[PDB]
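in:
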């Protein structure tokens, strides 16, 4: 390597948080093979992308402009203000106008083709052949009733984006020699055995055990486990799962490797423990900690890898099967039915998941017929993209390259707008890939290199996992390094600044938790310290500026120390606020961010993101439920940052405001509070207006996910009437619709107001509109559970959501069912709200 070539990797490693060159936690070369694998897709994409558009990353959408935003223009005319030094002219514009089309208009109307229309305050540009109606920023503006302010400045230089110059029939069998652990201790000497399983996509193909022996730090068997599957019947991506019961430890090994070579020889694998089903169990990675872990020792010794129409009534039997949720499990009679009629099943795209689950992948001949089936793909290829189907075929139930590859094929037609919607879940879905290199891994790579916004979020999502997942940090690290090597020095520089900032801040956050009561209230001595230490960074540490990781358009400047604090929580998160480093920004409002250690924010991200998906699903049907999914990025182990929504108050505090007698609750306060924060009667009804939708919004969403049973503290509202929930870190009620809410709406205990009619009316559309994507939500959710929560019941836990969405019912029985939830609120008022801790001591 070149000397300076090695100062780079060094750079890359500290941007990643893992050393992708290290080879001390491998027993083969699949990861290095995969660094090399991706060089071609990396370069292929770097080469093909437009320098000048990649530079500006215009945020754009082909979707139609929703009905609700259409009424927001009663004139087929849009007002775009333009700024240059002092003065600023305003220009009438048409929804269909174009950036070029108005730079030209601007010059004409003025008593040249080498500038650009940027936004004030942001690195967000209005550039390229898009209708102005189709720029995200513009659609966001019309929503909130804000003028569209744009500065005329010169395009950024593609030079800065430059990328550094790239330089038998034998039954299979396995010999278990022994296990070994440095220190077992627990209590009683329960016997112990191994469980050797041959798995494909969680499907078990075969199973064997060893004579149970009482637990001792060393245990030797020398035993050959004689499997039933034939060496030649082994399918690609087939794991030898090895397990230790007394379930204490597990480890995996791909039996067929990354060059289609059957595995062979001695292996000494270091096993993972079990914390007092989920995707960590599937990992091909071994435990880096070779000092404390249990160890299994094994030996392989065993290469290649080369008409008629249905009756009228089975057809119906089949169509029934195909017409059922992603969970409703298949019986052998189902499975044999889908298979005998592979070809009729193939004419229906929605059958595909179920159909490829009906494959016996422990048989060369039947896998072989499957690929023939995949060959003749005319009908799948033609179909519209169902992100649901696509995702179901990427989950843990499929471990065949070819199945998975045809799903990723289907993603290719997603525009960035949508890639951003599903990016997080796709990145988590990489966990279910048998092999480090993969269609999906290469697709995520392509799309981040093609679009700086996707590149940005892709970086954090990957860095988030590497940082806190030993099971997958290796595989993800290889993919990030892949990314980082083609994003350009422009971006590499932003990531370096961002990584600096957050690391300094995370120092400050933990040092503050250590110095404070186990929970009780911030001392004055903390307020001193916190402000003191921030100033101690504000000088010659904190970089000048940095992109806000949850909003990469926004560049934070210097801290506003006066406005910083430690939050009186229980953990001690930081309430930090920054000046905006952009002078062009037509405001003085700071950029608030919270920094928390002690909550696993990955759950929060996952939830915030589903929330976004919901908001776009209602977009498809012309509905706007005014959610407020604030930004929240996970950065490390139980540690990350959070956006501060401006001018929002907890509902707890608006109640607790008036005495706040631990729980004496009054129905009047909210509506009063709104008028206080509303100077004119005008802006008030607009607040009541929003509340209705915002409230309606969260009632539906919150219920569906089964996180609707929450305390006051964790629900906030803006001075401007937007209600929202927070803190989605992990008798009853369906959701929170307290009498104080209903008061704003007009009701007061088993009555009906004009606005409450409205409320119900909204909720029902919203509930119905979501059921139009039942499949989508069931798959997103269940994937959430496997890759995001603790170890879950791969039946019991997920089952809730099916019920919530009232699967297998008509719209009436379902609308009814929801209205009944509305009622269980009006029957319990404050009771569990009041019950929300009456427990304290
Ligand atoms: C902590 C946390 N963890 C997780 N995972 N998720 C969310 C939150 C979270 N986020 C908040 N945001 C501020 C508004 O924008 C959105 C975020 C707030 S405000 C609050 C009310 N408070 C403001 C006043 N103070 S104080 C005196 O500490 O400043 C009490 C807390 C508690 C709270 N908790």
């Amino acid at each position: 390597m070149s000397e300076e070539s090695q100062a780079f990797q060094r750079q890359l490693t500290a941007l990643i948080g893992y050393d992708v060159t290290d080879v001390s936690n491998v027993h083969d070369d699949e990861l290095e093979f995969t660094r090399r694998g991706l060089v071609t897709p990396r370069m292929a994409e770097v080469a093909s992308r437009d320098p000048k558009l990649y530079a500006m990353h215009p945020w754009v959408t082909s979707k139609p402009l929703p009905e609700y935003l259409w009424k927001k223009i009663a004139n087929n005319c849009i007002f775009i203000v333009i700024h240059r030094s002092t003065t600023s002219q305003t220009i009438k514009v048409s929804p269909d106008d174009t950036p070029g089309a108005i730079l030209q208009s601007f010059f004409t109307k003025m008593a040249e083709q080498d500038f650009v229309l940027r936004v004030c305050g942001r690195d967000e540009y209005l550039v390229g052949e898009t209708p102005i109606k189709n720029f995200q920023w513009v659609r966001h503006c019309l929503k909130n009733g804000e003028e569209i302010h744009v500065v005329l400045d010169t395009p950024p230089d593609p030079a800065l984006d430059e990328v550094r110059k790239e330089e038998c029939d034998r039954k299979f069998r396995v010999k278990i020699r022994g296990i070994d652990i440095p220190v077992l201790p627990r209590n009683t000497d329960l016997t112990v055995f191994v469980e050797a399983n041959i798995q494909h996509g969680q499907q078990v193909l075969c199973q064997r055990r060893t004579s149970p022996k009482p637990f001792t730090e060393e245990v030797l068997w020398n035993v050959w486990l004689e499997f039933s599957i034939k060496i030649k019947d082994l399918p690609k991506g087939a794991l030898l799962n090895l397990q230790i019961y007394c379930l204490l430890y597990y480890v995996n090994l791909l039996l067929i490797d990354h060059r289609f070579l059957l595995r062979r020889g001695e292996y000494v694998l270091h096993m993972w423990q079990i914390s007092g089903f989920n995707a960590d169990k599937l990992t091909s990675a071994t435990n880096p900690d070779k000092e404390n872990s249990m160890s299994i020792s094994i030996l392989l010794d065993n290469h290649p890898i080369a008409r008629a129409e249905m009756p009228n009534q089975l057809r119906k039997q089949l169509e029934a099967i195909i017409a059922t949720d992603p969970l409703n499990p298949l019986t052998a009679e189902d499975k044999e039915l889908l298979w005998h009629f592979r070809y009729e099943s193939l004419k229906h795209p929605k059958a595909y998941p179920k159909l490829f689950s009906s494959v016996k992948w422990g048989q060369q001949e039947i896998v072989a017929k499957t690929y023939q089936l995949l060959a003749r793909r005319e009908v799948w290829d033609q179909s519209a993209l169902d992100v649901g189907l696509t995702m179901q075929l990427l989950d843990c139930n499929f471990s065949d390259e070819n199945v998975r590859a045809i799903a990723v094929q289907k993603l290719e037609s997603l525009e960035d707008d949508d890639v951003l919607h599903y990016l997080l879940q796709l990145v988590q879905a990489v966990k279910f890939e048998p092999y480090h290199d993969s269609a999906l891994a290469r697709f995520l790579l392509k799309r981040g290199l093609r679009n700086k916004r996707i590149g940005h979020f892709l970086f954090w999502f990957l860095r988030s996992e590497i940082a806190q997942s030993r099971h997958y940090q290796q595989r993800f690290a290889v993919i990030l390094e892949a990314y980082l090597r083609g994003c350009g020095t422009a971006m590499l520089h932003d990531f370096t600044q961002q990584v600096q900032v957050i690391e300094m801040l995370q120092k400050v956050t933990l040092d503050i938790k250590s110095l404070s009561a186990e929970k009780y209230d911030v001392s004055s001595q903390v307020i001193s310290q916190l402000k003191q230490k921030l100033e101690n960074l504000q000088n010659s540490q904190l970089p000048e500026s940095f992109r806000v990781p949850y909003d990469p358009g926004l560049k934070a400047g210097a801290l506003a120390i006066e406005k910083c604090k430690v939050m009186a929580s229980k953990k001690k998160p930081l309430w930090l606020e920054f000046k905006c480093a952009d002078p062009t920004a037509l405001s003085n409002e700071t950029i608030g961010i919270i920094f928390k250690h002690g909550d696993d924010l990955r759950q929060d991200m996952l939830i915030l993101q589903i929330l976004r998906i919901m908001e776009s699903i209602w977009e498809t049907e012309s509905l706007d439920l005014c959610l407020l999914p604030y930004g929240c990025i996970s950065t490390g182990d139980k540690i990350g940052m959070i956006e501060i929504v401006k001018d929002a108050t907890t509902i707890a505090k608006i109640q607790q405001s008036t005495v706040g007698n631990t729980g004496a609750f009054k129905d009047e306060v909210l509506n009063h509070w709104l008028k206080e924060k509303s100077p004119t009667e005008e802006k008030f009804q607009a607040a009541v207006e929003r509340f209705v939708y915002s409230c309606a919004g969260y009632c539906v969403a919150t219920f569906v996910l089964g996180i609707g049973d929450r305390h006051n503290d964790n629900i906030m509202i803006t001075e401007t009437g937007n209600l929202f929930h927070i803190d989605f870190g992990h008798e009853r009620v369906p959701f929170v619709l307290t009498p104080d809410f209903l008061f704003v709406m007009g009701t007061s205990g088993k009555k009906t107001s004009p606005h409450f009619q409205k409320f119900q009316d909204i909720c029902v559309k919203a509930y119905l509109a979501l059921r139009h994507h039942t499949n989508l939500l069931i798959i997103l959710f269940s994937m959430m559970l496997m890759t995001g929560m603790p170890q879950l019941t791969s039946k019991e836990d997920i089952e809730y959501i099916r019920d919530a969405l009232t699967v297998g019912k008509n719209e009436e029985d379902a609308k009814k069912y929801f209205l009944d939830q509305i009622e269980v609120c009006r029957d319990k008022g404050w009771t569990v709200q009041f019950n929300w801790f009456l427990h304290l001591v």
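note: The first strand starts at residue 78 and ends at 83.
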